[PDB]
Write a protein that binds this DNA or RNA. Structure first.
Ligand SMILES: [Mg+2]
Ligand SMILES: [Mg+2]
Ligand SMILES: [Mg+2]
Ligand SMILES: [Mg+2]
Ligand SMILES: [Mg+2]
Ligand SMILES: [Mg+2]
Ligand SMILES: [Mg+2]
Lengths: 262, 70, 441, 58, 131, 185
RNA sequence: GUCUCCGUAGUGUAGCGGUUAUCACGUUCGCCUAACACGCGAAAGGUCCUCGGUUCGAAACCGGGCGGAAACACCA
RNA sequence: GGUGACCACGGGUGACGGGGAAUCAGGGUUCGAUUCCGGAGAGGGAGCCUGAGAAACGGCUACCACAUCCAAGGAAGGCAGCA
RNA sequence: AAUGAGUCCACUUUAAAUCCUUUAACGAGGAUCCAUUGGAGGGCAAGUCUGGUGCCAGCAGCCGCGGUAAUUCCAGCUCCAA
């Protein structure tokens, strides 16, 4: 190509978007933003396929342009704005708030939250550097950068960013024994406790995490988001508590649900 | 003589009275004669057979299902 | 809206046939002065400057270098009343087959004889072609025509009375003999090479006071060619009759493919239904239709149009084929046909097995007389006797013939523009007649 | 050429032309399968013949 | 009319488009597919509204007759219905007119107007002559 | 470019060698007994049984207690008992290999209506199903090869619009009635 | 469409305005063999591509049309 | 100096590469121009302006090959886009 | 007695249509509203039937058939395969 691409084929779209095949040839193609397009949920499919508030891209465009969609405390009129991980979606006209969190199957779930919980938001710091006049800076997992953080905050820690101010209220150090969530790879969406961290210089650090039920897995360091102090989460966990259960104990859960409902 | 590449071949005319449907300067379609460039049966050195003549099938002309283009 | 009329031009070799129509097309505004001067300069080198107006119709380079018309050709122009097109004739003993195609695709005609001494006498004679042309016009269906005498400028004295009268009376009595009405036909004196008496009355000759013409529809008075042709009879249109269309030619136009060209006789042709060509028996959807490089939504009868057809090649459809709608009755190949004929002149007797060439509309096919049924009196269709054994000139008979080559014909009782035919041999029209009964394959 | 093509189509020319008999239509599909199953699976013959074929020319 | 029944399901309301939308199924045991007009006022009686804000479409009938299923859309106000609803459904109810030329002709006019530069009267006269 | 799918597969496999008496006779016997149209719709059920047997053999090659083997074995046995070709108590991968295409052909709707007695013969059953007279639960089925599950076994019944359940007699019946009233006053 | 040439048994062609023949043949029949092979002798085979004209008469002299073999153009 | 019988280098390809497709005991043998990813090209080469991004061709310049109009002074082209 | 394949009203579909699914009214007794394509020596399921031809025409993937009594050509009838 002679320049950047601005189309996204329907079948080449990310799997977790859960887009079918027969509805179209193209995919939303999210605009550039705080999150990469591989792990973002554009508002068009969030409001058309996850909530069914809209039947068409035109209807979700009307909803967006009427300025009801507030993301992270700011109104976004972009139809294809990349929402991403744990950005608070706020609709004040219908009076509910959403937190965008992966489920046990590594897909963004429709997670409803109270306004007082929605007022804050967790972020994973991605780099800490000192800039001119000796001013410390902090770049989170979003594109959000802030000045003058707590000097105790190190790389790949978690910070509590209260909305409408953007400042830090609290933070969780990346330490052994802290509740985390996997934000990439096969274990995407699994909640557990940091148990071990082996570090390979010149390469990727591998962290071993054990969940509540005792199923211990591992993942790369860059795919980890600390979400709680020790074991109590600082956010509202979705249904299933991020406990991935295999198909063997999923099928009988389905059968028990059918028996109870029938 | 084939239209492409001008090569001259000999092609069998495969039924009882299908030679009379063939006159000079006809445009015939020729296919292989059965075994991949090898002669078949008692016909020496003949590896092709006529399927159509003047864009009408020899089978159609033999069964009388349609007529020569008069 | 405005009605379209086809006018053909018949005459002799070097009779001003193309010169006067070049003047006419320039003066009415078909071409421009720059183009006609370009024709003059092109004629200047090889000295055929007398035919710089003839080259408007003589589009062929062989036509230009030989000074004679080989094939018929078409032009369009708009008069003050309606829309007309014009076809030239070759005007030669050899190209009778070429000119009869144009005269067949005709609603009306004009006949040209040079007024000079030494040309009119050869023009109207046994070897003359004016007789043949006027005969074949009525034979093929030219109901009304006009006559314009040309090149009286070369007469001595130029533009005279008695020279005009001695020839208009001769042609009037000849067309009275053949069937035409001298009262109906208008007589126009024109000086072609000088370009006189087309738009305004030329004051060099005041002895001509204008013609008065009478006809069953009405009466008219004329002083110029335009005034003559602005009062012609509008022919009827067999729109209700199913589509029939002889094909004057077939072209391979770059970018659009095979376009047959012919004059719509019966029915209305519009892009959007399948048609069938009779002699070749091919079925094809029409893609577009067009007259004079201008698109038409419908092709009314009497329209000389080129129509574009799909998924066929130029070799499949040739000259003389007739097309018709497949949804209506499709025209198709005829094994034989019965005709009421009138033999005109033949040095010998006509018997069974005689194979002259029958020229019907656009097709020109040799037909072999299968047998003779009966002889017919010249008038009233009177039965004379059964099973003739020989035929002579000035006699009428019922003859059944089969064309050697495949040919589609129509009975005159059904398709009058297709039932007319002529018979040609030894460069004279041996027989003329119509078709009565046709069998189908 | 040796000149032996003139005999082309000789026998197909000399063959006398006998017309096809006009006969009743044959059932097709499931009915045909039913008929030919009934003919050769449900029938009893007391005659000898050592299981003679279906197109026996008796 | 004697035996025709509307049933609603997957009912929900969204203030974002100021409407209530659902998927409906109507049972016509021995009759053809019930006309959208008839569903309109029948559902209007069902929801105590008027049969001019009611919007239904997508009615496909199950094999063997009987049930047919479509998507029902009702608004709080006709101005909102005019505002956020497709023009083809508005034209189906007659509230919108699509009296306009062909796409081919529109492209022809655009390309011809490209040939005329700047000049207002010639740019507007570009499509006047070749109709 | 296009938004089609073109995901398709054949449902049958032709036999390896044609013109063998044993196979021809056995296939014709099944066709005649089950009222099948052609050899293709017995090759189809043969192919389905072949796929089932191949999956079962592949699962049996896996080690016992292997979770993939357990999960897919229970799923396959559940589907087999749902279609009813297998007994509910015979929940073993071994018993899948003991199945025959007669078990699958017996579960067709065409055979099911004949066994229930809604038709006087298997061919009468096939034509009755094709002419929209038989319904399952509430949906009418005009497919003879409709595999009948055990729960849908009891709900097979005449169609309500057919001239065997509700009213509305046939076109020839109504023509005969109008001829009767036109001939006899 | 125009122009140039050719068209006699089935192929190879003699031929005269007053006779279209043969030849290598091709075919058939006798001629020897179970079948052949070789070999001997006879017959058929023509609207002279077709149609007409000139002539007392034409295949041939001419006018066409047809088919084949060459060329030139022909763009609603 | 560097590379080569562990096949360099050269040549051929009826070679765009891959995900994949056919066949099907197991192992394999053929096919993948073709809707997804990546590359290349816009008649053949070549050189550029603009712009963040082009050696762009539904941008320009030149040559070659085809080819349109012309009042013969000039002018205008690029369907391996949809038809 | 039962149905469609067709005609065909309306609904439905759809940007607008079309098609499908609904549903009126016609619509089957050679139900002529007509199933074909290849074969019948063997391989390989199916005829030592009848009539022509007579090493000719032709068939035949391979063995092979045909020279006057052809299970193999050309046809009729009858069978076989899908
Ligand atoms: Mg290549
Ligand atoms: Mg590829
Ligand atoms: Mg690509
Ligand atoms: Mg490029
Ligand atoms: Mg820019
Ligand atoms: Mg370039
Ligand atoms: Mg036989």
């Amino acid at each position: 190509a002679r320049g950047p691409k601005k189309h996204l084929k329907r079948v080449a779209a990310p799997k977790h978007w859960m887009l079918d095949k027969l509805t179209g040839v193209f995919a939303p193609r999210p605009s550039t933003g705080p999150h990469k397009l591989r792990e973002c949920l554009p508002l068009i499919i969030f409001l058309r396929n996850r909530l069914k508030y809209a039947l068409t891209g035109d209807e979700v465009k009307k909803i967006c342009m009427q300025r009801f969609i507030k993301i992270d405390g700011k109104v976004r009129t972009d139809i294809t704005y990349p929402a991403g991980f744990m950005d608070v979606i706020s609709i004040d006209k219908t009076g509910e708030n959403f937190r965008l969190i992966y489920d046990t199957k590594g897909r963004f779930a429709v997670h409803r939250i109270t306004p007082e919980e929605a007022k804050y938001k967790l972020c994973k710091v991605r780099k800490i550097f000192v800039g001119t006049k000796g001013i410390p800076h902090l770049v989170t997992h979003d594109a959000r950068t802030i000045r003058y953080p707590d000097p105790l905050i190190k790389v790949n820690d978690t910070i509590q960013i209260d909305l409408e101010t953007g400042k830090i209220t609290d933070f969780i150090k990346f330490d052994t024994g802290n509740l985390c969530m996997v934000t990439g790879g096969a274990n995407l969406g699994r909640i557990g406790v940091i148990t071990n961290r082996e570090r390979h210089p010149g390469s990727f650090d591998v962290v071993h995490v054990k969940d509540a039920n005792g199923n211990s897995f591992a993942t790369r360091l860059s795919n980890i988001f600390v979400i709680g102090k020790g074991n109590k989460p600082w956010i509202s966990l979705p249904r299933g508590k991020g406990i991935r259960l295999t198909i063997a104990e999923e099928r009988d859960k389905r059968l028990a649900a059918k028996q109870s409902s029938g | 003589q084939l239209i492409k590449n001008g090569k001259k071949i000999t092609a069998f005319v495969p039924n009882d009275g299908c030679l009379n449907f063939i006159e000079e300067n006809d445009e015939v379609l020729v296919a292989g004669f059965g075994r991949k460039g090898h002669a078949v049966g008692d016909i020496p050195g003949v590896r092709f057979k006529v399927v159509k003549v003047a864009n009408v099938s020899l089978l159609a002309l033999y069964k009388g299902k349609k007529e020569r283009p008069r | 809206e405005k009605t379209h009329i086809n006018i053909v031009v018949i005459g002799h070799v070097d009779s001003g046939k193309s010169t006067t129509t070049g003047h006419l097309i320039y003066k009415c505004g078909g071409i421009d002065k720059r183009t006609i001067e370009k024709f003059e300069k092109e004629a200047a080198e090889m000295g055929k400057g007398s035919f710089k107006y003839a080259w408007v119709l003589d589009k062929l380079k062989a036509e230009r270098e030989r000074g004679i018309t080989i094939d018929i050709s078409l032009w369009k122009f708009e008069t003050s009343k309606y829309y007309v097109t014009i076809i030239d004739a070759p005007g030669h003993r050899d190209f009778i087959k070429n000119m009869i195609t144009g005269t067949s695709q005709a609603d009306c005609a004009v006949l040209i004889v040079a007024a000079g001494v030494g040309e009119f006498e050869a023009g109207i004679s046994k070897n003359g072609q004016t007789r043949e042309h006027a005969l074949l016009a009525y034979t093929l269906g030219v109901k009304q025509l006009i006559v314009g005498v040309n090149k009286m400028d070369s007469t001595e004295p130029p533009y005279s009375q008695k020279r005009y009268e001695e020839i208009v009376k001769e042609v009037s009595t000849y067309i009275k003999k053949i069937g035409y009405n001298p009262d109906t036909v208008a007589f126009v004196p024109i000086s072609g090479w000088n370009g006189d008496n087309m738009l305004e009355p030329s004051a060099n000759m005041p002895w001509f006071k204008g013609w008065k013409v009478t006809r069953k529809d009405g009466n008219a008075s004329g002083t110029t060619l335009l005034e003559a042709l602005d009062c012609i009879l509008p022919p009827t249109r067999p729109t209700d009759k199913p589509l029939r269309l002889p094909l004057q030619d077939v072209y391979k136009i770059g970018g659009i493919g095979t376009v047959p060209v012919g004059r719509v006789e019966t029915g209305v042709l519009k892009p959007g239904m399948v048609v069938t060509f009779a002699p070749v028996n091919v079925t094809t959807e029409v893609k577009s239709v067009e007259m004079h490089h201008e698109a038409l939504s419908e092709a009314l009868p009497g329209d000389n149009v080129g129509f574009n057809v799909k998924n066929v090649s130029v070799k499949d459809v040739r000259r003389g084929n007739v097309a018709g709608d497949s949804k209506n009755d499709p025209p198709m190949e005829a094994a034989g046909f019965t005709a009421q004929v009138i033999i005109l002149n033949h040095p010998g007797q006509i018997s069974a097995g005689y194979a002259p060439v029958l020229d019907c509309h656009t097709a020109h096919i040799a037909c072999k007389f299968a047998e003779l049924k009966e002889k017919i009196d010249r008038r009233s269709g009177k039965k004379l006797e059964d099973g003739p054994k020989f035929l002579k000139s000035g006699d009428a008979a019922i003859v059944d013939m089969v064309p050697g080559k495949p040919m589609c014909v129509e009975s005159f009782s059904d398709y009058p523009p297709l039932g007319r035919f002529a018979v040609r041999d030894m460069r004279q029209t041996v027989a003329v007649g119509v078709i009565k009964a046709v069998d189908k394959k | 050429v040796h000149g032996s093509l003139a005999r082309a189509g000789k026998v197909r020319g000399q063959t006398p032309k006998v017309a096809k008999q006009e006969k009743k239509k044959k059932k097709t599909g499931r009915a045909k399968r039913r008929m030919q199953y009934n003919r050769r699976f449900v029938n009893v013959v007391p005659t000898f013949g050592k299981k003679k074929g279906p197109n026996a020319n008796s | 009319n004697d035996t025709v029944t509307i049933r609603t399901r997957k009912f929900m309301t969204n203030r974002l488009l100021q409407r209530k939308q659902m998927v409906i199924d109507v049972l016509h045991p021995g009759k053809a597919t019930v006309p959208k007009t008839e569903i309109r006022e029948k559902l209007a009686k069902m929801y105590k509204t008027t049969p001019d804000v009611i919007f239904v479409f997508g009615f496909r009938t199950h094999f063997g007759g009987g049930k047919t299923t479509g998507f029902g859309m009702i608004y709080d106000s006709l101005d909102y219905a005019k505002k956020n609803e497709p023009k083809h459904r508005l034209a189906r109810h007659g509230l919108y007119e699509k009296k306009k030329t062909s796409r081919k002709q529109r492209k022809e006019r655009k390309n011809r107007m490209k040939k005329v530069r700047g000049t207002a009267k010639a740019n507007v006269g570009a499509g006047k002559k070749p109709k | 470019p296009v938004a089609r799918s073109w995901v398709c597969r054949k449902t049958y496999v032709t036999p390896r060698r044609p013109f063998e008496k044993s196979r021809l006779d056995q296939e014709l016997k099944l066709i005649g007994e089950y009222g099948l149209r052609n050899k293709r719709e017995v090759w189809r059920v043969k192919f389905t049984l072949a796929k089932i047997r191949k999956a079962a053999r592949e699962l049996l090659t896996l080690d016992e207690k292997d979770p993939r083997r357990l999960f897919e074995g229970n799923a396959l046995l559940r589907r087999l008992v749902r279609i009813g070709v297998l007994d509910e108590g015979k929940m073993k991968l071994d018993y899948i290999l003991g199945l025959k295409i007669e078990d699958f052909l017996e579960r067709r709707l065409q055979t099911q209506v004949f066994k229930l007695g809604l038709a006087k013969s298997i061919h009468h059953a096939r034509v009755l199903i094709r002419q929209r007279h038989i319904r399952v639960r509430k949906q009418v089925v005009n497919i003879p090869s409709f595999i009948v599950r055990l729960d849908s076994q009891k709900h097979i019944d005449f169609s309500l619009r057919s001239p065997y359940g509700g009213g509305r007699p046939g076109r020839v019946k109504r023509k005969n009635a109008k001829k009767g009233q036109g001939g006899a006053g």
